[PDB]
Design an enzyme around this catalytic site. Structure first.
Site, PDB file in Angstrom:
ATOM      1  N   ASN A 130     -45.129   7.393 -89.082  1.00 42.71           N
ATOM      2  CA  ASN A 130     -44.476   6.093 -88.941  1.00 42.71           C
ATOM      3  C   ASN A 130     -42.964   6.171 -89.124  1.00 42.71           C
ATOM      4  O   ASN A 130     -42.235   5.389 -88.511  1.00 42.71           O
ATOM      5  CB  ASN A 130     -45.067   5.103 -89.941  1.00 42.71           C
ATOM      6  CG  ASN A 130     -46.484   4.709 -89.599  1.00 42.71           C
ATOM      7  OD1 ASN A 130     -46.958   4.944 -88.490  1.00 42.71           O
ATOM      8  ND2 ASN A 130     -47.171   4.097 -90.553  1.00 42.71           N
ATOM      9  N   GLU A 186     -64.075  -3.102 -94.247  1.00 43.70           N
ATOM     10  CA  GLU A 186     -63.729  -4.466 -94.630  1.00 43.70           C
ATOM     11  C   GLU A 186     -63.830  -5.411 -93.433  1.00 43.70           C
ATOM     12  O   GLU A 186     -63.543  -5.016 -92.299  1.00 43.70           O
ATOM     13  CB  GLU A 186     -62.321  -4.527 -95.219  1.00 43.70           C
ATOM     14  CG  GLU A 186     -61.210  -4.105 -94.276  1.00 43.70           C
ATOM     15  CD  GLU A 186     -59.920  -3.795 -95.007  1.00 43.70           C
ATOM     16  OE1 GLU A 186     -59.895  -3.930 -96.250  1.00 43.70           O
ATOM     17  OE2 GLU A 186     -58.932  -3.420 -94.344  1.00 43.70           O
ATOM     18  N   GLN A 238     -58.100   0.421 -90.288  1.00 41.74           N
ATOM     19  CA  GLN A 238     -57.103  -0.634 -90.141  1.00 41.74           C
ATOM     20  C   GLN A 238     -56.080  -0.273 -89.077  1.00 41.74           C
ATOM     21  O   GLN A 238     -55.848  -1.044 -88.136  1.00 41.74           O
ATOM     22  CB  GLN A 238     -56.401  -0.905 -91.469  1.00 41.74           C
ATOM     23  CG  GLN A 238     -55.512  -2.134 -91.423  1.00 41.74           C
ATOM     24  CD  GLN A 238     -55.366  -2.812 -92.764  1.00 41.74           C
ATOM     25  OE1 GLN A 238     -55.618  -2.211 -93.805  1.00 41.74           O
ATOM     26  NE2 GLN A 238     -54.944  -4.068 -92.747  1.00 41.74           N
ATOM     27  N   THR A 279     -47.166   5.133 -98.783  1.00 36.47           N
ATOM     28  CA  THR A 279     -47.758   3.844 -99.106  1.00 36.47           C
ATOM     29  C   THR A 279     -48.767   3.898-100.244  1.00 36.47           C
ATOM     30  O   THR A 279     -48.898   2.917-100.980  1.00 36.47           O
ATOM     31  CB  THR A 279     -48.421   3.262 -97.840  1.00 36.47           C
ATOM     32  OG1 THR A 279     -47.417   3.028 -96.846  1.00 36.47           O
ATOM     33  CG2 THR A 279     -49.132   1.953 -98.118  1.00 36.47           C
ATOM     34  N   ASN A 314     -47.347   0.231 -82.536  1.00 32.76           N
ATOM     35  CA  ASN A 314     -48.594   0.182 -81.792  1.00 32.76           C
ATOM     36  C   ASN A 314     -48.361   0.016 -80.295  1.00 32.76           C
ATOM     37  O   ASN A 314     -49.099   0.588 -79.486  1.00 32.76           O
ATOM     38  CB  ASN A 314     -49.446  -0.968 -82.318  1.00 32.76           C
ATOM     39  CG  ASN A 314     -49.866  -0.765 -83.753  1.00 32.76           C
ATOM     40  OD1 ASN A 314     -49.659   0.301 -84.322  1.00 32.76           O
ATOM     41  ND2 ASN A 314     -50.457  -1.793 -84.346  1.00 32.76           N
ATOM     42  N   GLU A 348     -57.660  19.936 -67.498  1.00 33.86           N
ATOM     43  CA  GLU A 348     -56.505  20.767 -67.183  1.00 33.86           C
ATOM     44  C   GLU A 348     -55.518  20.810 -68.338  1.00 33.86           C
ATOM     45  O   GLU A 348     -54.864  21.839 -68.550  1.00 33.86           O
ATOM     46  CB  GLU A 348     -55.822  20.264 -65.912  1.00 33.86           C
ATOM     47  CG  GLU A 348     -56.732  20.215 -64.702  1.00 33.86           C
ATOM     48  CD  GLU A 348     -55.985  19.880 -63.426  1.00 33.86           C
ATOM     49  OE1 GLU A 348     -55.045  20.624 -63.075  1.00 33.86           O
ATOM     50  OE2 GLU A 348     -56.337  18.877 -62.771  1.00 33.86           O
ATOM     51  N   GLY A 365     -59.047   5.831 -97.021  1.00 36.38           N
ATOM     52  CA  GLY A 365     -60.340   6.346 -97.440  1.00 36.38           C
ATOM     53  C   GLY A 365     -61.398   6.323 -96.353  1.00 36.38           C
ATOM     54  O   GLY A 365     -62.045   7.340 -96.078  1.00 36.38           O
ATOM     55  N   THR A 366     -61.579   5.171 -95.703  1.00 36.59           N
ATOM     56  CA  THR A 366     -62.590   5.077 -94.655  1.00 36.59           C
ATOM     57  C   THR A 366     -62.189   5.825 -93.390  1.00 36.59           C
ATOM     58  O   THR A 366     -63.028   6.508 -92.796  1.00 36.59           O
ATOM     59  CB  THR A 366     -62.924   3.609 -94.352  1.00 36.59           C
ATOM     60  OG1 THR A 366     -64.081   3.550 -93.509  1.00 36.59           O
ATOM     61  CG2 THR A 366     -61.787   2.875 -93.673  1.00 36.59           C
TER      62      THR A 366
HETATM   63  N1  LIG Z   1     -48.657   3.005 -87.149  1.00 33.87           N
HETATM   64  C1  LIG Z   1     -49.445   2.266 -87.919  1.00 33.87           C
HETATM   65  N2  LIG Z   1     -49.768   2.699 -89.186  1.00 33.87           N
HETATM   66  C2  LIG Z   1     -50.568   1.955 -89.979  1.00 33.87           C
HETATM   67  C3  LIG Z   1     -51.072   0.752 -89.525  1.00 33.87           C
HETATM   68  N3  LIG Z   1     -51.831   0.226 -90.507  1.00 33.87           N
HETATM   69  C4  LIG Z   1     -51.822   1.068 -91.563  1.00 33.87           C
HETATM   70  N4  LIG Z   1     -51.032   2.137 -91.255  1.00 33.87           N
HETATM   71  C5  LIG Z   1     -50.753   3.300 -92.114  1.00 33.87           C
HETATM   72  O1  LIG Z   1     -51.924   4.033 -92.408  1.00 33.87           O
HETATM   73  C6  LIG Z   1     -52.024   4.298 -93.789  1.00 33.87           C
HETATM   74  C7  LIG Z   1     -53.051   3.383 -94.428  1.00 33.87           C
HETATM   75  O2  LIG Z   1     -54.293   3.663 -93.834  1.00 33.87           O
HETATM   76  P1  LIG Z   1     -55.367   2.493 -93.610  1.00 33.87           P
HETATM   77  O3  LIG Z   1     -55.679   2.333 -92.146  1.00 33.87           O
HETATM   78  O4  LIG Z   1     -54.911   1.199 -94.230  1.00 33.87           O
HETATM   79  O5  LIG Z   1     -56.649   3.068 -94.373  1.00 33.87           O
HETATM   80  P2  LIG Z   1     -58.104   2.505 -94.024  1.00 33.87           P
HETATM   81  O6  LIG Z   1     -58.576   3.092 -92.719  1.00 33.87           O
HETATM   82  O7  LIG Z   1     -58.101   0.999 -93.991  1.00 33.87           O
HETATM   83  O8  LIG Z   1     -58.990   3.076 -95.233  1.00 33.87           O
HETATM   84  P3  LIG Z   1     -59.472   2.116 -96.421  1.00 33.87           P
HETATM   85  O9  LIG Z   1     -58.260   1.665 -97.180  1.00 33.87           O
HETATM   86  O10 LIG Z   1     -60.397   2.865 -97.347  1.00 33.87           O
HETATM   87  O11 LIG Z   1     -60.187   0.922 -95.843  1.00 33.87           O
HETATM   88  C8  LIG Z   1     -50.646   4.032 -94.350  1.00 33.87           C
HETATM   89  O12 LIG Z   1     -49.844   5.179 -94.224  1.00 33.87           O
HETATM   90  C9  LIG Z   1     -50.133   2.935 -93.448  1.00 33.87           C
HETATM   91  O13 LIG Z   1     -48.730   2.986 -93.367  1.00 33.87           O
HETATM   92  C10 LIG Z   1     -50.754   0.310 -88.252  1.00 33.87           C
HETATM   93  O14 LIG Z   1     -51.194  -0.758 -87.839  1.00 33.87           O
HETATM   94  N5  LIG Z   1     -49.938   1.071 -87.449  1.00 33.87           N
HETATM   95 MG   LIG Z   2     -58.667  -0.900 -95.240  1.00 33.47          MG
END
Ligand SMILES: Nc1nc2c(ncn2[C@@H]2O[C@H](COP(=O)(O)OP(=O)(O)OP(=O)(O)O)[C@@H](O)[C@H]2O)c(=O)[nH]1
Ligand SMILES: [Mg+2]
Ligand SMILES: Nc1nc2c(ncn2[C@@H]2O[C@H](COP(=O)(O)OP(=O)(O)O)[C@@H](O)[C@H]2O)c(=O)[nH]1
Ligand SMILES: Nc1nc2c(ncn2[C@@H]2O[C@H](COP(=O)(O)OP(=O)(O)O)[C@@H](O)[C@H]2O)c(=O)[nH]1
Lengths: 357, 31, 442, 48, 49, 430, 49, 430
Positions: C205, C70, C10, C178, C227, C253, C143-144
């Protein structure tokens, strides 16, 4: 027995049935309404027909699949005079209206134009001779109406006043700003002109003015009021006492063919990467073609970047948010089409103007 | 008599609870 | 010349949207993939090539894959504004998530998907002629991202071998959090990141929120701001490949100058002229001011204070109108400071780069337009404090086996928790030992 | 090359048209079945 | 410019989780019709031809 | 990712009718089944709860079961009743009599095969199946007996999916049925083995919600069932709309349950505003959070002040900053630190969804896992022991065929659940 | 690419008896058998001299 | 490739009249015999069932036999009766009396030569002859006795053709005739030796089809005989129309019968659904497969869940893709693998024909060979043994002349059929 037969082809069935498929588009000035597409079918046995709306959405496996929902359910609809819909009403270029919206996607009565017609499975062709096609009473009213000569003279002098004063001798920019106060699009799908809007319009021509004395100001007010009253009463009005903008530009700009409208819309569709009704100023800057213009390439009388900046100037909302709606684009090309006579010159300059893919 | 929920409010919050809008701040070190 | 971007889950896909928005706008590719043939200076003018390849019809398509379990985020990309930019094969989506379980991603679900991803990456790597690394974006908290990121890095490391892999990683922040199970996933992730990455950049973050509140004037930030900052950093680091400059810096380098020992590859990142347009008219922005800025801990994108440790190497990237003599004067001023200390075995602590292309301005963005910027990546012993707090939180939960039955049910031995916790303890001891001044004869 | 590109554009347009026609036929058949059901129900009520 | 034969359709207000009144109490006859044990067709509405 | 609903007994069928009204309203589905909505965002996930029938129509993935059709005849006569598939109504010929043994053993075994056939037909139609959702009361007869029977059979047939229940539990002050302790104890025994996650609601808490918070002059069961349908449709909202931080039923279960027996949760829904005070308080994330933690807004009789939170979850709907959500959850955890179990470093999960319910700017649903739930089970066990020692009504159950040993097993299992909660409440780091 | 299957439905009349009531610890547990995996310790230990 | 039909007894003549109505409708033949159809596809295979009479007319290649003319006079007076050739009606002067021995030995041998003469004239008139098709009931008197007599004679004269039977068999709950077990047992003894393929239908199963699936308020024998005529005309559809994967009666037999005694099949037809329900469920290939395997849609009282499928066949009508058919049959075999005999790697044959029946978008007919048929034979053998020990009604049969050894062999042969089915049900690879 051909090799491209589907499930419902007549070569794969014993029973037979009659029908008439068609595709439609919506006649509206709204930007988002231009992207929509409709399809339907007509059954002459019951003189009833339906119409659907088609949308493109991602599917389960990743690629796009088309989805549809009703826009007009099956019913035996009638005209304004009570007669039924025959088969001749669904020809190409037929404009008809059915009634008030039956879902939440619209907010008022709209007109529909047939763009495609298939009759491979039609066996009962019904038609009434010496009768109008579709349900287009507004077009008939426009055709049968007659306007006064003094109104045409007043609009001629008003157009001259805009072309000189508001522009700088450039007719396209002058005509573009002429419909500045009638940009808003109503729920009907067309733009309306109020009397106060007309008074503000005529005053902006910068022609009815003199020294700032009290008597001169009163005389200018009387003159502009008389001119505005003369123009206002020469056109048909609807409820709430407003006139139509398209019928106004029929006598300001003149008649325009369907091919010109189609080409303008095709350019707008290509330039719009979202599906809203707005264009970004950065896209206009990137896609315009000041570089190959002969006044900058072979004559060296103008500079390319300066003329690009001057072109970015004319849009009304370039310095604040940079969004150009559909109506402003159509106003600019209304001016452009009014300026040129021949079809091939129009199409060549239209193709050379934008360096799209 | 109307019956009542047997729980009384304890938890309280406020808008903008952080100090100067910052989660944490580093101390000043001289030179 | 070429670099391939891999976006996972995500955070990685959402950061990818901002990155590719920026790279398009900087090179001039339209959302449907077509340069107006004016944005370049003549023929034999190939600068996009680091990130785009052109078709024979002249459409541009980008060198990226998007990986998710997802559908929703990838379907948002498919239905958004950039629909026509990406090749549809590049956007890969599964049916259901790894539900914040590293074990589910690694063993159950990612194990099914990994060979399609490797086949897509192969199709990218075959369309290159001077590939010089992979850039990977993921979060280790979910997780992923943890499970499939680890599995995919393992497979990439066997198949491609020596090619470099640079990660931008969102680590669990020290007090904003989170999800409950973040420590387990982050601990299990770090073993793979230790073995299978050449340089790893750590992000939190909470630091980017602090930076956007303090420096920018934004009261209510959201992930799109973070981002956009990440995209700016990546553009600064890759600018050295794409535009003319006085002192270029190839990606090899960085590794040669920045990494002293093969385990010591975790780096801090900071960016100097984060400033608003209204602030921009109150201040000059000279070279020495932004050089002084990159060393303050208020500028960092990870919540650690480098004053509690010693620097081993710094890499300073300058872009825009800068002259080398001013860079030298700035670095000498940094060197005079008494609160900045280098380990005594690293006397020549700095590497410099100087590029002429100034940073690009994005229509919806919040950064001001500026003629010059500097970006820093540095290796420092302060990172050991981040591990100690994650390890303490792991020890607190694991003492009672608080959630372990989920992990054991989805296929993992209980032993793996203790192994990973001991590996992070050894990494902590490595950072203690490398930072110890000199030695003794007895 | 120009001729090849324009031919490819025409082919893509034809493909899209076919994909739309399939759904159109589906909807027409559904309406026919609905009307048949209505007539059968009316007959049953009259007999009762 | 006059409205044609088909009529405007009206849409009801949204169902907020609060702010609802006892509209079920406005009836004055609560006879219940037996459908499941008796009617084979049940109360399926089929439109007229 | 498709959910299958089951509605059992009078309470279940009525709540289901209101739920499907709320869901049809949110997606703009006419009671004829025709889509009349106004955004593509509504259509692209309609599959989650509806199946598509030909030329427009949608049908709701629900099975209705009851032993006498009276309630079903009321729902079929209702304003949305036509939407339901006729073949989905399963009924017997005589009532449950509020007796667990009758509902489980005599009419249960008679009907259950037709219910399993309908549930399998409905489940296998999904392209990918998510958990089941069941609504029933535990104090009743067909609700308790057929709900737990069907749950056990579905757990045999679909052990890898999620099993979710919404359940009505007897008020502490006034009984609606005399034999409630037996039915409740046996049902809780069945649930703790079979269920993955269970939510409990007291009707007394909904009455006090309506009277004190909403100040309704003449509330009806339609209002209580609307509040329940609102929270039920809210928990699943992130499944079916885009958002900045997606969430899923399995992700809630993974974050909420520390140990497999501890899967009973408290529920609440926040933006309830009084009939004459909306002018006095603007919507904001702090206001939602303040209502979210107020025990006045919780749908069970147990109060958090006598226990500690192991875990909690908040799902936000609306356009809002992530910073405000995170800092609110930090501030609440830091300021009230004694009410949170100390050997877990963060007890609250947050999630954010872009699309609010119609006519509300923002909404949140709150799920809480709190040890004060042990007080309810202790009270039920006391009332069970009072009745069982004297054989107060036991001859009905024994005459149906039940072994007395079943009652002692259920009592022992509930007593061990109470002990386990008490032990985890007073655990320490040392 | 999986499409929907077809189920014929089981018979469970004879499996329910009052003498076979549920007991503690008899719930259905889905435990995946564990699969071992190898690890690659390519990185050498710290050698600072 | 021409089929010859034989209609025997009251049940056979009544079902036949409706069958020839259905076939004449499908090919657009007026009751005067004039072609009035609307596609060439109807005419190009008309020869399969019709002979050409002069200046337009077509006559159907069928023989009607009965011992009392009452039924024949009723069908001749019917609306399509004129189409039948006058010389093809053969009748006696006194009834069979529901007695197998009378129908087989006294009036059977008296009439049979005139029937064989007509059947030979019809067979030798074909340019190429396909199998015979016979409709009769097994519980009756002239149907069972004279039908099996004729079957034996046709098998002597035409041993290389196919012999196919549709047969009505006694319900498990209510008898239509008191002496049904004797007539059924003797007829099954004759059929298992003589027949190539036999289909069995319970009138009680048709009642359950009508009431549960179609919900008819007032069904009549015309509806039951229409369902049967629909399935009968469906099995032959691929013989007489083009298609993507042609099939034939001999090819069906080769794929369905593993060993020559195991030739008894269950039948079903899929797009059955009530007028109220049709708005709730669209037609689709998964839907046909789901109805196809539902025991509710099968025309026998035995249920597949007590047996195992050796083989099955599905014939699809319409223009459709092969991918969904093949993958659906694979998915059903994989998911329900315990109900499929494991030493055969694929039990289902598919076939696809372009032309559906008029007014349906798609249809399938299903033929199934399942070991659960053994319970029906066991029930008939039990009732036979109950009657024989007490010599029940035997004097009628013995007075006609039958030896008791026929009864003991037929009972033994059915018992051996039940044992052989039971052995193959529980067989294993080892
Ligand atoms: N900087 C930033 N952090 C994010 C963003 N989206 C989620 N996070 C952070 O990343 C963590 C959540 O990880 P996710 O990316 O949602 O986990 P995932 O890869 O979707 O893994 P699954 O839930 O199993 O599908 C939390 O600490 C969120 O605050 C984003 O768009 N930018
Ligand atoms: Mg997810
Ligand atoms: N919230 C709510 N509770 C209900 C409703 N109907 C019944 N109940 C409660 O459920 C319990 C009665 O259970 P019941 O549904 O009659 O059991 P059944 O006889 O097996 O169907 C009592 O506590 C009632 O107050 C309803 O519509 N809404
Ligand atoms: N399905 C069906 N069964 C029938 C019909 N007519 C008779 N039967 C059944 O066949 C059996 C009676 O056999 P019958 O034809 O009278 O024998 P026959 O006296 O030798 O002609 C009984 O089980 C009847 O229910 C019919 O039109 N349809």
């Amino acid at each position: 027995h051909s090799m491209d037969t589907t499930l419902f082809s007549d070569e794969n069935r014993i029973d037979r049935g009659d029908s008439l498929l068609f595709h439609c588009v919506q006649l509206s000035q709204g930007g988002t309404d231009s992207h929509r597409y409709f399809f339907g079918c007509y059954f002459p046995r019951w003189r009833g027909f339906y119409m659907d709306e088609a949308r493109e959405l991602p599917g389960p496996l990743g690629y796009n699949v088309t989805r549809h929902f009703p826009a007009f359910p099956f019913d035996v609809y009638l005209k304004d005079d009570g007669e039924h819909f025959l088969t001749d009403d669904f020809q190409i270029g037929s404009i008809f209206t059915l009634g008030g919206p039956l879902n939440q996607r619209d907010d008022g009565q709209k007109r529909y134009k047939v763009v495609h017609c298939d009759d491979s499975q039609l066996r009962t062709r019904t038609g009434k001779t010496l009768a109008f096609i579709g349900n287009n009473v507004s077009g008939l009213l426009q055709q049968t109406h007659r306007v006064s000569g003094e109104a045409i003279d007043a609009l001629k002098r008003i157009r001259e006043a805009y072309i000189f004063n508001v522009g700088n001798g450039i007719p396209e920019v002058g005509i573009k700003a002429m419909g500045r106060h009638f940009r808003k699009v109503g729920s009907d799908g067309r733009r309306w002109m109020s009397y106060e809007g007309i008074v503000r319009f005529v005053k902006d021509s910068r022609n009815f003015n003199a020294t700032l004395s009290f008597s001169d100001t009163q005389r200018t007010e009387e003159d502009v009021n008389t001119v505005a009253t003369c123009i206002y009463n020469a056109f048909p009005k609807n409820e709430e006492e407003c006139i139509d903008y398209d019928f106004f530009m029929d006598y300001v700009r003149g008649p325009m063919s369907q091919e010109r409208k189609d080409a303008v819309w095709n350019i707008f569709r290509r330039m719009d990467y979202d599906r809203d009704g707005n264009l970004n100023i950065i896209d206009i800057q990137a896609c315009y073609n000041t570089q190959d213009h002969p006044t900058c390439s072979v004559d060296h009388l103008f500079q390319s970047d300066k003329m690009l900046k001057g072109f970015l100037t004319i849009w009304d909302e370039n310095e604040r948010c940079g969004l150009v709606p559909y109506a402003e684009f159509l106003d600019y090309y209304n001016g452009v089409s009014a300026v040129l006579e021949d079809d091939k010159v129009f199409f060549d300059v239209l193709n050379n103007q934008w360096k799209l893919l | 008599q109307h019956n009542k929920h047997p729980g009384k409010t304890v938890m309280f919050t406020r808008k903008d609870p952080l100090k100067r809008g910052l989660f944490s701040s580093y101390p000043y070190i001289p030179e | 010349r070429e670099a391939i971007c891999i976006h996972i889950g995500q955070a990685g896909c959402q950061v990818g949207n901002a990155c590719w928005e920026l790279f398009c706008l900087e090179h001039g590719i339209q959302p449907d993939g077509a340069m107006p043939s004016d944005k370049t200076i003549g023929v034999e003018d190939d600068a996009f090539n680091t990130f785009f390849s052109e078709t024979g019809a002249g459409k541009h398509v980008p060198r990226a894959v998007f990986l998710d379990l997802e559908p929703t985020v990838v379907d948002e990309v498919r239905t958004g504004t950039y629909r026509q930019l990406f090749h549809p094969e590049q956007l890969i989506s599964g049916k259901e998530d790894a539900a914040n379980n590293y074990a589910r991603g690694h063993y159950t679900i990612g194990k099914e998907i990994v060979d399609l991803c490797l086949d897509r990456i192969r199709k990218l790597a075959d369309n290159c002629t001077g590939l010089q690394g992979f850039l990977v974006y993921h979060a280790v908290g979910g997780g992923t991202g943890s499970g499939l990121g680890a599995l995919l890095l393992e497979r990439l490391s066997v198949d491609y071998g020596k090619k470099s892999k640079l990660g931008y990683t969102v680590y669990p922040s020290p007090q904003v959090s989170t999800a409950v199970v973040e420590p387990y996933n982050s601990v299990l992730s770090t073993h793979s990141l230790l073995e299978h990455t050449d340089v790893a950049a750590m992000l939190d973050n909470e630091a980017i929120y602090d930076l956007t509140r303090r420096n920018l004037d934004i009261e209510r930030p959201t992930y799109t701001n973070l981002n956009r900052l990440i995209g700016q950093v990546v553009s600064s680091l890759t600018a050295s490949l794409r535009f003319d400059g006085a002192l270029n810096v190839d990606l090899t380098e960085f590794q040669t100058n920045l990494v002293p020992y093969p385990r010591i590859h975790f780096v801090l990142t900071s960016y100097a002229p984060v400033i608003s347009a209204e602030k921009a008219y109150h201040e000059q922005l000279s070279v020495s001011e932004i050089s002084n800025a990159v060393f303050e801990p208020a500028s960092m994108m990870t919540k650690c204070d480098p004053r509690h440790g010693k620097y081993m190497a710094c890499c300073l990237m300058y872009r825009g109108d800068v002259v080398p003599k001013d860079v030298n004067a700035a670095v000498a001023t940094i060197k005079t400071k008494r609160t900045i200390q280098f380990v005594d075995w690293s006397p020549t602590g700095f590497k410099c780069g100087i590029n002429y292309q100034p940073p690009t301005v994005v229509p919806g963005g919040d950064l001001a337009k500026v003629q010059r910027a500097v970006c820093m990546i540095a290796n420092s012993t302060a990172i050991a404090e981040v591990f100690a707090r994650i390890d303490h939180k792991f020890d607190l939960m694991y003492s009672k086996r608080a959630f372990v039955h989920w992990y054991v049910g989805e296929g993992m031995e209980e032993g793996e928790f203790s192994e990973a916790r001991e590996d992070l303890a050894a990494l902590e001891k490595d950072y203690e030992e490398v930072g110890a001044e000199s030695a003794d004869m007895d | 090359k120009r001729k090849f590109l324009e031919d490819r554009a025409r082919q893509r347009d034809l493909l899209r048209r076919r994909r739309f026609m399939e759904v159109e036929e589906e909807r027409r058949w559904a309406q026919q079945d609905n009307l048949q059901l209505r007539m059968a129900n009316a007959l049953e009520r009259q007999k009762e | 410019y006059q409205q044609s034969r088909a009529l405007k359709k009206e849409f009801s207000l949204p169902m907020v989780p609060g702010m609802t009144c006892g509209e079920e109490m406005l009836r004055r006859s609560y006879h219940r019709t037996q459908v499941h044990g008796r009617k084979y067709d049940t109360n399926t509405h089929i439109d007229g031809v | 990712r498709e959910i299958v609903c089951v509605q059992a007994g009078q309470c279940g069928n009525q709540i289901g009718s209101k739920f499907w009204e709320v869901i049809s309203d949110e997606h703009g589905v006419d009671p004829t089944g025709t889509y009349q909505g106004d955004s593509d965002l509504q259509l692209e996930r309609i599959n989650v709860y509806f199946d598509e029938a030909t030329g427009g129509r949608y049908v709701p993935r629900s099975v209705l079961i009851d032993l006498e059709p009276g309630t079903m005849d009321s729902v079929r006569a209702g304003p949305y009743g036509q939407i339901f598939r006729p073949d989905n109504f399963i009924f017997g010929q005589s009532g449950a009599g509020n007796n667990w043994a009758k509902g489980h053993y005599t009419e249960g075994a008679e009907l259950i095969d037709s219910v399993l056939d309908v549930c399998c037909k409905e489940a296998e139609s999904c392209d990918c199946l998510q958990g089941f959702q069941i609504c029933h009361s535990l104090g009743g007869g067909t609700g308790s007996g057929m709900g737990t029977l069907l749950i056990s059979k579905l757990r045999e047939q679909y052990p890898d999916r999620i099993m979710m229940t919404f359940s009505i539990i007897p008020s502490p002050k006034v009984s609606d049925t005399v034999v409630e302790p037996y039915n409740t104890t046996l049902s809780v025994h069945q649930l703790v083995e079979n269920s993955d996650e269970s939510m409990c609601i007291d009707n007394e808490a909904l009455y006090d919600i309506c009277f004190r918070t909403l100040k309704l002059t003449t509330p009806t069961f339609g209002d209580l069932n609307h509040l329940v349908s609102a929270v039920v449709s809210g928990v699943t909202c992130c499944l079916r709309f885009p958002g900045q931080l997606n969430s899923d039923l399995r992700k809630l279960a993974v974050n909420l349950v520390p140990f497999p027996r501890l899967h009973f949760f408290m529920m609440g829904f926040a933006p309830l505003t009084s009939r004459g005070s909306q002018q006095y308080r603007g919507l904001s994330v702090p206001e939602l959070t303040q209502q979210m933690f107020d025990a006045k807004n919780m749908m069970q009789a147990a109060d958090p002040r006598h226990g500690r939170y192991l875990t909690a979850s908040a799902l936000f709907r609306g356009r809002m900053s992530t910073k405000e959500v995170d800092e609110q959850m930090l501030n609440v955890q830091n300021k009230n630190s004694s009410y949170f179990i100390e050997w877990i470093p963060n007890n609250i999960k947050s999630s954010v969804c872009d699309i609010p319910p119609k006519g509300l700017k923002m909404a949140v649903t709150f799920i809480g896992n709190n040890t004060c739930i042990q007080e309810m089970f202790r009270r039920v066990g006391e009332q069970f022991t009072l009745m069982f020692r004297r054989k107060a009504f036991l001859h009905w159950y024994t005459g149906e065929g039940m072994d007395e040993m079943e009652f002692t097993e259920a009592e022992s299992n509930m007593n061990d659940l109470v002990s386990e909660y008490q032990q985890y409440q007073d655990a320490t780091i040392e | 690419f999986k499409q929907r299957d077809a189920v014929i439905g089981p018979i469970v009349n004879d499996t329910v008896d009052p003498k076979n009531f549920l007991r503690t610890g008899q719930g259905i547990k889905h435990i995946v058998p564990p699969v071992p995996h190898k690890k690659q310790h390519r990185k050498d230990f710290l050698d600072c001299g």
